[PDB]
Tab-separated table of N, CA, C and O in Angstrom:
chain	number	residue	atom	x	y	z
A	1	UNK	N	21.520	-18.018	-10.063
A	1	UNK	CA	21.748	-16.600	-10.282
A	1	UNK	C	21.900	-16.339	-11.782
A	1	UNK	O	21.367	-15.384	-12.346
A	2	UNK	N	22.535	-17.099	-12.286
A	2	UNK	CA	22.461	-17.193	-13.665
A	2	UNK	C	21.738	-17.206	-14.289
A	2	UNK	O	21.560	-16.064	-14.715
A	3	UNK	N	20.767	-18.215	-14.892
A	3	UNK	CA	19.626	-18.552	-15.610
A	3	UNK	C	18.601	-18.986	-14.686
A	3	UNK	O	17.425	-18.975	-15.050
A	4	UNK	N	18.964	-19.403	-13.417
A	4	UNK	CA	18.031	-20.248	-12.625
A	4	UNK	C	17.007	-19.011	-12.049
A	4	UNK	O	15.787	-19.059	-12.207
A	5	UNK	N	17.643	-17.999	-11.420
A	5	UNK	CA	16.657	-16.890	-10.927
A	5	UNK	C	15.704	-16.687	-11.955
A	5	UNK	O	14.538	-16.487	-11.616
A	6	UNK	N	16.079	-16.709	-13.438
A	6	UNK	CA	15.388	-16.174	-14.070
A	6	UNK	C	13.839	-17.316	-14.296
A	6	UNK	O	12.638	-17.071	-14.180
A	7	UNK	N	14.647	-18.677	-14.681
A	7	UNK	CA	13.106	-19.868	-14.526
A	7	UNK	C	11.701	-19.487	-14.155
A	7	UNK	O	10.560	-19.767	-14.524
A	8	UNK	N	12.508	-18.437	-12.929
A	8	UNK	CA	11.351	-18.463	-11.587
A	8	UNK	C	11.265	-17.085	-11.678
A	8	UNK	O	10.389	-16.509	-11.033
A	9	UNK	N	12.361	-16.199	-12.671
A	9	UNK	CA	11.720	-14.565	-13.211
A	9	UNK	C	10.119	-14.735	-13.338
A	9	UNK	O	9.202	-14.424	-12.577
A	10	UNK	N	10.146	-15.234	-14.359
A	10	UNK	CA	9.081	-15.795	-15.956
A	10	UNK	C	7.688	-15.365	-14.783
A	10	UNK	O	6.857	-14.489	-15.022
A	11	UNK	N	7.716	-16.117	-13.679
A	11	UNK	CA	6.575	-16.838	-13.113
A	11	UNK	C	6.307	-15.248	-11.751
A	11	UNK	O	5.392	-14.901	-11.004
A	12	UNK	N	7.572	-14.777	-12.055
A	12	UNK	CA	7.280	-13.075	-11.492
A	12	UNK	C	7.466	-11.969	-11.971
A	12	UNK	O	7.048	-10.927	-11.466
A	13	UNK	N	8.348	-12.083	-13.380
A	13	UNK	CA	7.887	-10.909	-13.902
A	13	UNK	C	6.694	-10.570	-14.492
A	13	UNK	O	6.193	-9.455	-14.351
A	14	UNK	N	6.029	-11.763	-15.371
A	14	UNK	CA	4.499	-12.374	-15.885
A	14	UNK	C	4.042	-11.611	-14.563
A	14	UNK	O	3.626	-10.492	-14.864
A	15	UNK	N	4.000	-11.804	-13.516
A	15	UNK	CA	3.311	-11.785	-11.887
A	15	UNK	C	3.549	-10.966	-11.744
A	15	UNK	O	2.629	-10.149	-11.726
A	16	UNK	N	4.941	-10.462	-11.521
A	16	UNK	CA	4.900	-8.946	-11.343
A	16	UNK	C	4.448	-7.856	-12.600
A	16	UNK	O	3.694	-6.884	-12.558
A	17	UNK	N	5.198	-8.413	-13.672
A	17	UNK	CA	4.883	-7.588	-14.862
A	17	UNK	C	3.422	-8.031	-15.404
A	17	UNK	O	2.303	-7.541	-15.253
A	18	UNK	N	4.090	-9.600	-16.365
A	18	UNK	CA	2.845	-9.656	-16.995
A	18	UNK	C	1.432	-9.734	-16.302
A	18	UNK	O	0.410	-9.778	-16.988
């Protein structure tokens, strides 16, 4: 929840965003 959700942000915000 901390940093770890985010690891796997990267690979969906990129996905979702980027």
């Amino acid at each position: 929840k901390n940093l770890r959700r985010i690891i796997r942000k990267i690979i969906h915000i990129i996905k979702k965003y980027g």
